[PDB]
Structure 1
Amino acid sequence: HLFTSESVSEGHPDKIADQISDAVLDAILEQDPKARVACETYVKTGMVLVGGEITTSAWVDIEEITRNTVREIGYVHSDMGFDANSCAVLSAIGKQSPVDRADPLEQGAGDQGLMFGYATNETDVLMPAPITYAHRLVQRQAEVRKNGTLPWLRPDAKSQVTFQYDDGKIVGIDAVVLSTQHSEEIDQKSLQEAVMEEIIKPILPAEWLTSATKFFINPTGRFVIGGPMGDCGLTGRKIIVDTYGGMARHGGGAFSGKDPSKVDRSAAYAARYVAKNIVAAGLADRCEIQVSYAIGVAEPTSIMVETFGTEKVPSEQLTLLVREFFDLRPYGLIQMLDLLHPIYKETAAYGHFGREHFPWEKTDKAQLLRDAAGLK
């Protein structure tokens, strides 16, 4: 069969909104690590609207956080359709809606919901190949735009990779899409050769690129208008890009702009952490975790482990190890993963999962899980 996933660059308007939301979150957590933050951003030609509810002792400058984020992304001139130095920034940020515990670890969930984690040993970083290489294509586009290798590139870009599988194994790459914004000073033919040479070939493994592979580079031609000029961007509209590219299920909650007390974000991080350590322990080839919560209840209402027939130990045992080695209570997750730190703007583009310096990507429980099962 074929499976397809996509990603978008840090200049895509939905991702601009995600990064502004988490830049606000980071600036707040730097002063007030216990802050409650629920920040929603809306970007369109000329303006950023930052809204939501915030409870914090922190004192932050929303305007400057927003301009600096957009400057880092690279929209700094009206020729690009958007300018961090001259766009409008509006705030519509209020307070969180008008009981506690002797042990904060026993705090009930702040909302109901369901979340999934996923891992698979088909890549080094234990992620599905399609989303992994889609992410690397747009990240390479930004890297090559920012270091001056291809200075006619502009921030907005989209990628899409179609993989072929045979009996759960990767046979190769069937189709690649790469669309990138660019200035007026480059023709489409020169663009396609440069993108192929400096973006696609350095990233996609040559063993997976046959002569049957289809390459769609700026398939409809010029791409000069981009970013918020062409399209609205909103926080939480790339939740599949943010996670597993559709290879795994998704419970619906957005990540960006939410402090770690929102189970939508922190329980999804914890579910990635469980699944990755199960696969890294060699207990399965691929593993999907579902957890759900009820508002006001600390213990998850459900925990499901799915291994698609690839488990190396009984699935009844895998469920036991998950409960034995992980604390999936709302504030348990926060403590287990040390989440009260300004680390979240970096997650808001190129994927929350896959990059092994995030705390939910550490495999520091794999050897323990292996020992607690039938040893090594």
Structure 2
Amino acid sequence: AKHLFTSESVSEGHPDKIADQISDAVLDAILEQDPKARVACETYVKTGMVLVGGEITTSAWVDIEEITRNTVREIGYVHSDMGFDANSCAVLSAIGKQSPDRADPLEQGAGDQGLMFGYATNETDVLMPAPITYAHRLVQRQAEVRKNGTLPWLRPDAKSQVTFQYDDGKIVGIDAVVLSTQHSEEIDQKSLQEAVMEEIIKPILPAEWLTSATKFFINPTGRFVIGGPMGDCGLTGRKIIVDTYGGMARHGGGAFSGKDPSKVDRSAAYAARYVAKNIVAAGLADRCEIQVSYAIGVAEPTSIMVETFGTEKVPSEQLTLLVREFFDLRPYGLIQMLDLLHPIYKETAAYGHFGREHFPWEKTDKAQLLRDAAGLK
């Protein structure tokens, strides 16, 4: 049935994402010294200032001020005319440090309760929904042409959104695309929307999807000139949907950035992306969403639920069997299943946690084994 579905994305240097990036950049920096460190680092940016506030239990010593400034500079906020300067903004810390003091480590129970969801679909190359995939690809392309000198009047902040028309389950094409970019006072609007169209939109959106009818809204109000932390306000865990799946599938509360892998909010969600992506690569289903939950101090998950939406090639019973077979979903298990104690996390913080094939949770190594045990085909 024809029906439209939208998803948004934002660039690095969008305030919420700056906060994400800084947090995860502190996590990485600690994890590189002490991989078993427990961190919970939350960040707040506002026009003059970054507050990095946390609870951290680690042996490591790391320079919060330096880490913050360096993250703000790669993003590009390096002069007051932009809105925010990495070299003169205030950086404040309120991170409580603690340094450290079952029979099977794998049986260690979950720290904090919760629910996590994971999804895959055969509708892109990357087993991700088409909307959030292109949505991210627009903002990433924006950062690219910004950063590579091609379109250098572009400044950091930027938001994209693409609405897809499906008739049923076939992505038929793109109804609308909106994109908004901070820019210098040097360029004009009509000059801008030529370049955004040629260099940013036209190379990313598949041309067959783009029609005579496609409503493009490039800078619709827009002379976007100051941006980033000037007059907006960034906090970690606010681009939670964008991080995930653009709202194609569901979500439990929970934020990723600034949480070390002992946090199920993160590692269980990553593990769920891994279990569904494996299910779909094996052809057990076309579309798969999984809910796993935990309760504090229990180690086995309190619930697993698979929804393959009429798209199975094996009954959901057998599916649920294989899920709780090939995958260790005890907190410490999924940490070991995906080899998580490594500084790989700042890369996660912008352009989306999933869909980007080089992350441990994006591997389809269990493809065949799942196929086999689910009645070889």
Common topology (TM > 0.5): yes
Aligned-pair CA distance for 1:230: 2.3
Aligned-pair CA distance for 1:203: 0.3
Instruction: Indicate conservation of the 8 Å contact 2:161/2:177, yes or no.
Output: yes
In structure 2, the residue corresponding to 1:333 is in which secondary structure? helix
In 2, distance between residues paired with 1:133 and 1:150? 20
CA 1:126–1:71 in structure 2 vs 1: closer, same or farther (change >3 Å)? Answer: same
Instruction: Indicate conservation of the 8 Å contact 2:58/2:99, yes or no.
Output: no
- Partner residue of 1:59? 61
CA 1:182–1:75 in structure 2 vs 1: closer, same or farther (change >3 Å)? Answer: same
Aligned-pair CA distance for 1:79: 1.0
- Partner residue of 1:43? 45
**Structure 1 portions without partners, runs of 5+:** none
In 2, distance between residues paired with 1:137 and 1:10? 12
Alignment coverage as a number of residue pairs:
375
CA-to-aligned-CA distance 1:188-238 (integer Å, 9 cap, x gap): 000000000000010000010011111000000200021001200000000
- Partner residue of 2:356? 355
Aligned-pair CA distance for 1:168: 1.0
Report percent identity of matched pairs.
100
How do 1:217-366 and structure 2 match up within 5 A?
Answer: 217-366=218-367
Instruction: Indicate conservation of the 8 Å contact 2:46/2:234, yes or no.
Output: yes
CA-to-aligned-CA distance 1:42-84 (integer Å, 9 cap, x gap): 0000110000100000110000000010111010111101011
CA 1:302–1:97 in structure 2 vs 1: closer, same or farther (change >3 Å)? Answer: farther
Instruction: Indicate conservation of the 8 Å contact 2:46/2:233, yes or no.
Output: yes
**Structure 2 portions without partners, runs of 5+:** none
In 1, distance between residues paired with 2:104 and 2:70? 39
CA-to-aligned-CA distance 1:308-334 (integer Å, 9 cap, x gap): 100111111100110110000101010
Aligned-pair CA distance for 1:96: 6.5
Q: Which runs of 4+ in 1 moved over 6 A?
A: none
Aligned-pair CA distance for 1:101: 1.4
In structure 1, the residue corresponding to 2:178 is in which secondary structure? strand
Aligned-pair CA distance for 1:335: 0.3
In 2, distance between residues paired with 1:256 and 1:31? 18
Instruction: Indicate conservation of the 8 Å contact 2:31/2:341, yes or no.
Output: yes
In structure 1, the residue corresponding to 2:356 is in which secondary structure? coil
In structure 2, the residue corresponding to 1:228 is in which secondary structure? coil
Aligned-pair CA distance for 1:9: 0.1
Instruction: Indicate conservation of the 8 Å contact 2:283/2:371, yes or no.
Output: yes
In 1, distance between residues paired with 2:268 and 2:320? 17
In structure 2, the residue corresponding to 1:65 is in which secondary structure? helix
CA 1:97–1:214 in structure 2 vs 1: closer, same or farther (change >3 Å)? Answer: farther
Alignment RMSD (CA, Å):
1.2
In 2, distance between residues paired with 1:103 and 1:232? 44
In 2, distance between residues paired with 1:92 and 1:74? 25
In 2, distance between residues paired with 1:214 and 1:366? 39
Aligned-pair CA distance for 1:97: 12
